[PDB]
Amino acid sequence: SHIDCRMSPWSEWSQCDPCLRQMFRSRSIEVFGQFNGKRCTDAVGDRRQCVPTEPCEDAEDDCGNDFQCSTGRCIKMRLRCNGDNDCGDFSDEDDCESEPRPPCRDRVVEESELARTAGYGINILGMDPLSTPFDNEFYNGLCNRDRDGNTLTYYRRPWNVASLIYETKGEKNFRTEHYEEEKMFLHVKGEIHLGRFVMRNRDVVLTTTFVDDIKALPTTYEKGEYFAFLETYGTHYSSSGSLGGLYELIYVLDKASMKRKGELKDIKRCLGITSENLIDDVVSLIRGGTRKYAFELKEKLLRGTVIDVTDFVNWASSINDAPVLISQKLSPIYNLVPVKMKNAHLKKQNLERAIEDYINEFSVRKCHTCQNGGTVILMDGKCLCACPFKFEGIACEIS
Amino acid sequence: SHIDCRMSPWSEWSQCDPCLRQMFRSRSIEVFGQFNGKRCTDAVGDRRQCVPTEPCEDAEDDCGNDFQCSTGRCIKMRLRCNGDNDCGDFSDEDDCESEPRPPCRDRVVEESELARTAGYGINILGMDPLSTPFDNEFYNGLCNRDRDGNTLTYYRRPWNVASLIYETKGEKNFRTEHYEEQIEALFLSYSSKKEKMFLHVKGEIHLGRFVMRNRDVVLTTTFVDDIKALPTTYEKGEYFAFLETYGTHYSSSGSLGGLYELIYVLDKASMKRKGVELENLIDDVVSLIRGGTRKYAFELKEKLLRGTVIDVTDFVNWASSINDAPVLISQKLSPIYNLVPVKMKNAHLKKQNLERAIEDYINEFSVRKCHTCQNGGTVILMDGKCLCACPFKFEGIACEIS
Amino acid sequence: SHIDCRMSPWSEWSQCDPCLRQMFRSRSIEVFGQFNGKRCTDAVGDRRQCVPTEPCEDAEDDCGNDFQCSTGRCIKMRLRCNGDNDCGDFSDEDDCESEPRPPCRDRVVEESELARTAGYGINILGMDPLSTPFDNEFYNGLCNRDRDGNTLTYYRRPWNVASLIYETKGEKNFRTEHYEEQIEALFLSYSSKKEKMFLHVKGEIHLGRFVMRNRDVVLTTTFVDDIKALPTTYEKGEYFAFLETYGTHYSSSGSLGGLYELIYVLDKASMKRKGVELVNITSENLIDDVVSLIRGGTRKYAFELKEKLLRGTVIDVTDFVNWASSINDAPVLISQKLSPIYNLVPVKMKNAHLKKQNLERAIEDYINEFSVRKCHTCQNGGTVILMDGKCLCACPFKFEGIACEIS
Ligand SMILES: *[C@@H]1O[C@H](CO)[C@@H](O[C@@H]2O[C@H](CO)[C@@H](O)[C@H](O)[C@@H]2NC(C)=O)[C@H](O)[C@H]1NC(C)=O
Numbered sequence A: 001s002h003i004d005c006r007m008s009p010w011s012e013w014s015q016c017d018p019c020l021r022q023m024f025r026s027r028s029i030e031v032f033g034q035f036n037g038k039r040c041t042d043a044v045g046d047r048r049q050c051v052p053t054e055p056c057e058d059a060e061d062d063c064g065n066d067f068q069c070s071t072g073r074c075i076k077m078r079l080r081c082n083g084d085n086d087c088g089d090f091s092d093e094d095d096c097e098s099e100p101r102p103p104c105r106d107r108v109v110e111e112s113e114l115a116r117t118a119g120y121g122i123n124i125l126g127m128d129p130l131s132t133p134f135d136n137e138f139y140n141g142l143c144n145r146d147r148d149g150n151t152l153t154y155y156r157r158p159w160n161v162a163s164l165i166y167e168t169k170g171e172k173n174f175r176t177e178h179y180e181e182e183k184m185f186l187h188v189k190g191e192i193h194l195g196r197f198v199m200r201n202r203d204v205v206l207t208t209t210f211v212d213d214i215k216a217l218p219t220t221y222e223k224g225e226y227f228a229f230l231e232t233y234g235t236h237y238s239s240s241g242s243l244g245g246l247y248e249l250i251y252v253l254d255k256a257s258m259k260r261k262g263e264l265k266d267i268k269r270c271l272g273i274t275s276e277n278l279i280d281d282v283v284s285l286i287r288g289g290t291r292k293y294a295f296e297l298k299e300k301l302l303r304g305t306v307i308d309v310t311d312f313v314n315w316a317s318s319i320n321d322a323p324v325l326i327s328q329k330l331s332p333i334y335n336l337v338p339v340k341m342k343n344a345h346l347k348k349q350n351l352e353r354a355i356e357d358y359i360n361e362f363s364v365r366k367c368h369t370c371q372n373g374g375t376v377i378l379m380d381g382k383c384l385c386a387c388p389f390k391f392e393g394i395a396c397e398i399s
Numbered sequence B: 001s002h003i004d005c006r007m008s009p010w011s012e013w014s015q016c017d018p019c020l021r022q023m024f025r026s027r028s029i030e031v032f033g034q035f036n037g038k039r040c041t042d043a044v045g046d047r048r049q050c051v052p053t054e055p056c057e058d059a060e061d062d063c064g065n066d067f068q069c070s071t072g073r074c075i076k077m078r079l080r081c082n083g084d085n086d087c088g089d090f091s092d093e094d095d096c097e098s099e100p101r102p103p104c105r106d107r108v109v110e111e112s113e114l115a116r117t118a119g120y121g122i123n124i125l126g127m128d129p130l131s132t133p134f135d136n137e138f139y140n141g142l143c144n145r146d147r148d149g150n151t152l153t154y155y156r157r158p159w160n161v162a163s164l165i166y167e168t169k170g171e172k173n174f175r176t177e178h179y180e181e182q183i184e185a186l187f188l189s190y191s192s193k194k195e196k197m198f199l200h201v202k203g204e205i206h207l208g209r210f211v212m213r214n215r216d217v218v219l220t221t222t223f224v225d226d227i228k229a230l231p232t233t234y235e236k237g238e239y240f241a242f243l244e245t246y247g248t249h250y251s252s253s254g255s256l257g258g259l260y261e262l263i264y265v266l267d268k269a270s271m272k273r274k275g276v277e278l279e280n281l282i283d284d285v286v287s288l289i290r291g292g293t294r295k296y297a298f299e300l301k302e303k304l305l306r307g308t309v310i311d312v313t314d315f316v317n318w319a320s321s322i323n324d325a326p327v328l329i330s331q332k333l334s335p336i337y338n339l340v341p342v343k344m345k346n347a348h349l350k351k352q353n354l355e356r357a358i359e360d361y362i363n364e365f366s367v368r369k370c371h372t373c374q375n376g377g378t379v380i381l382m383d384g385k386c387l388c389a390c391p392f393k394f395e396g397i398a399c400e401i402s
Numbered sequence C: 001s002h003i004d005c006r007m008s009p010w011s012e013w014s015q016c017d018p019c020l021r022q023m024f025r026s027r028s029i030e031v032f033g034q035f036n037g038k039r040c041t042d043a044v045g046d047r048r049q050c051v052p053t054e055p056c057e058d059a060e061d062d063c064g065n066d067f068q069c070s071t072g073r074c075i076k077m078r079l080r081c082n083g084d085n086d087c088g089d090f091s092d093e094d095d096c097e098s099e100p101r102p103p104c105r106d107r108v109v110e111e112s113e114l115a116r117t118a119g120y121g122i123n124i125l126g127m128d129p130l131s132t133p134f135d136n137e138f139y140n141g142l143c144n145r146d147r148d149g150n151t152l153t154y155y156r157r158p159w160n161v162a163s164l165i166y167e168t169k170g171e172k173n174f175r176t177e178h179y180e181e182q183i184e185a186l187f188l189s190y191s192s193k194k195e196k197m198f199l200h201v202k203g204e205i206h207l208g209r210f211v212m213r214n215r216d217v218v219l220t221t222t223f224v225d226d227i228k229a230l231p232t233t234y235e236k237g238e239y240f241a242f243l244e245t246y247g248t249h250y251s252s253s254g255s256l257g258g259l260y261e262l263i264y265v266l267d268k269a270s271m272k273r274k275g276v277e278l279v280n281i282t283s284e285n286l287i288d289d290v291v292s293l294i295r296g297g298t299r300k301y302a303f304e305l306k307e308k309l310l311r312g313t314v315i316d317v318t319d320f321v322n323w324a325s326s327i328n329d330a331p332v333l334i335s336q337k338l339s340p341i342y343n344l345v346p347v348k349m350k351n352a353h354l355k356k357q358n359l360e361r362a363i364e365d366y367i368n369e370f371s372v373r374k375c376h377t378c379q380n381g382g383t384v385i386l387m388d389g390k391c392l393c394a395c396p397f398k399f400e401g402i403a404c405e406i407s
């Protein structure tokens, strides 16, 4: 049967760490859950506030030659009269003596909907409550810019974006492969690429929240607190990626079932069925584009219309409204630790430890194998099995 | 099992290099892991803040006979009050009290987006195009111009662009091959039926061709500042970070345009044999379109995935929109290190190190150090892991089965 | 195996060029990287800053009684005060404040774009046209008006272009060939059906020829400056970069025009084959291959015609005329007479002859150094092609692969 959560008490309770004023704790989680059994919900480490064991050492260094930005994110003093909110709170612009001289002194340029989102954090297991640690609204007082050819609108390239390239690149693929001696496969893939981005490797400007949480992390391997940070910002960020939207469909039969369910010439005529049912529940995936267009696309195609070229074009236009990531290269978020931060490298190593422990703990091997065979899966808080090869039950108990 | 990725140890720390106030370590990627081995997402470089051993030998230097802007670029005095932005800045222009004589002296002339974006940086891995290292708003106080041609409008050619012709070409190739064979006959007897058709359609539009000046080039202030920040001692991770920020090459010339292609292939067979001694089907269709605006490109993508003969109006609409959204349909690569300016501190040493960094980057991300495909499929170095693909029935994460 | 490309060792460093503050190295391309080896993208030459070992022998010269502009060009005094910009940045005209006299007395004259672009630079490697090295905005104080001919608009012929004649020509050339056979017959026996068709169509339009002036020719300031900024010693990479930015030749004459072309070929064969050794075979193969090309003219008409051309559709002459008329707006250099770019290196310049010779030699080495000759042979005698930094061959038959290694 399903297995309920199994847990341990906190195995440790720390000293009242000097700058933190907390007695942190560590516990363990023994079994999240299995076969849809009751997930665990407790934190893998508690903590307690406490009067600190010693005076805090932060003694924070002022910006000095840099502008004394209200949030402490020191900036080139020239950026006080930026007119550009290089400080976190316009205190640059407010401390300018009403001497506006914005970047793109004469030119007209906008801010990209996408570049604000560029440099997505990613939990390799999930997704992050704050999409980016990058503050993609810094410009260092430049106005590098790219043109959307679809509108001739210029957008500023925010300083963390080392490259931005809008590019129409449509791809579509349709494949069928079928043997009997017996199998059938049908595949459809549709990629609407929209643009490349690349993130700067150096001098990145982060959100004040992120550097505050880096100050909140101790130089100790505060494993549970490091995990709490990591779930705030993911295991990696994306340093390059392709944005836009995609859809994907497959239809798969036995070769004998293909000939009965079939005429392949009618299937092609639907590409370029009304008497059949089993053609209806094809696999379908849509990502990006405004949900209305994806819904009506599904409602037509699952009812087995021919391919509505106009609905596909309308969804592609909707991708301009609701773009999504198509592919990325990831880099671990510890690379974002500012090199001048106190104990920066130590915190970076403790982050690498946290990452490795994250992988080690949430590997599916924490749960049992299925009661007969097939695939074991981990859902968040509980494992399960799936066995589509004519097996059944929450553990594939039946075949 | 598959083999997960693996990495070397870290190097020792470098010395604490002056001015940059850091020490560094290096860590080669031993294996990416074929067979869907666990990815190596992790950084090859490490760096730590350090108090330097000795005073900073300043990277900054004087510009005597040249106006030193607020950006670090020093320009000939003739370019002050030139009316053009010659520094990525207006420190050359905001000072100006009088006689802002523009070098295009009372003639109408536009910017060209072809010129502004010309010279794209390129990562040789995947040929991914990148922002141009050149500053294409600098005109050296000249007024070289040519016509956009299809419209009778002149645009000003930026100093970094030595040529930019606007030749209209249209090309289109259409090829079809079809084969059917039947053979009938140890004593051996045959019944076999084979059917193959190959249909290949590709068409090209050329918008123009640029060529880059390569001596006296003027580069973005960010790019030269990043070269200043680059360490002299070949800290490989920092050089790889630079190469990924800017790519390893720039297009020193290329054609802008737009492209589309369509392939249809079918093989169908019924093979049998008997003898005396003492069905499979594959179809695939792929349509690719590059450049032009979304609407027309994707409408053609639909109308080309259909076998319907396209309306020439749609083709011409896409062709026109290619002027709005061209693609670098071809380029000639030049190594990015040639853009490293002479007359800069350790510039030649940095060039040496950049060449070594490009070598190591190509090697360190070589698929060559991934295990073979089982059935000889094309081995793919994806992000941090290796795999292979096979066209034949042999299939799976290494084509292990069939 | 693939064969990774290979390069020479660096040459020795040159001496420091006393005026150029620089020293240089050369590096031959030993092997291009056949069979999709490593690409040899690395630079053929390298240069290093040097504090010079001796004083510069200055590159400036005294033009004497000639006006010496803000740019290095020197011009005869009468060209001052022309109203025409006879030098860089009107410096010949900013030298003038009173009694301006345009040689186009009492009239306005159009600037011809075809004259402005005439004298295209050319690189022999793909015959790509580069920009004209000529300064076609120099009239030398003349007002030679010519008609556009396709239009009555009169334009002032610039001094460099000795002739621009709208010697209009139009051509259409058409050929079709059709061949068909049916043949019916240890030993081998076969019966066959065979059909061959070829169709070839090209049309040319000529808008006119330019002839560049043999003598007294005035060049752009950047061109002459780039000849000044040249090592005087032979320095493979520095002259190669010059030829790469200007081309090894210029059109001393050329015809502007437009061109379209359509090729259609069909080959169809049917074979039946039976063999006996001291088998029965049936085969059908069809090959159908169509290519359509248009060059010049405005995109709208060029592409509309080219699509209507590619289809079996009969072209309405009105659209063909609209394209041929738009060729007046966007011509293409359909032909040229090539002169070596070093013939533009002006006599009466410091080391002029030596730089001529050095460019001659650099062009020699450039032809040689990027010669496909040193690629490996094709395995099936297909055409070896030098790509950017890698070399291969292609073959049209069933023998196929990156070197046609299989069939
Ligand atoms: C040699 O092979 C021929 C095919 O490869 C074969 O022709 C076939 O004959 C069938 C009747 O026996 C007929 O139904 C089928 O259409 C077919 N025809 C063609 C054009 O392929 C010949 O009969 C065979 N020769 C002998 C002597 O058996």
Ligand SMILES: *[C@@H]1O[C@H](CO)[C@@H](O[C@@H]2O[C@H](CO)[C@@H](O)[C@H](O)[C@H]2NC(C)=O)[C@H](O)[C@H]1NC(C)=O
Residues within 6 Å of the ligand: C315, C316, C317, C318
């Ligand atoms: C030359 O071009 C004209 C214009 O396209 C063609 O004129 C057509 O002539 C046919 C009869 O030959 C008529 O049926 C059409 O109505 C005409 N069209 C127009 C617009 O007038 C003419 O046919 C062409 N001739 C040749 C030999 O190609």
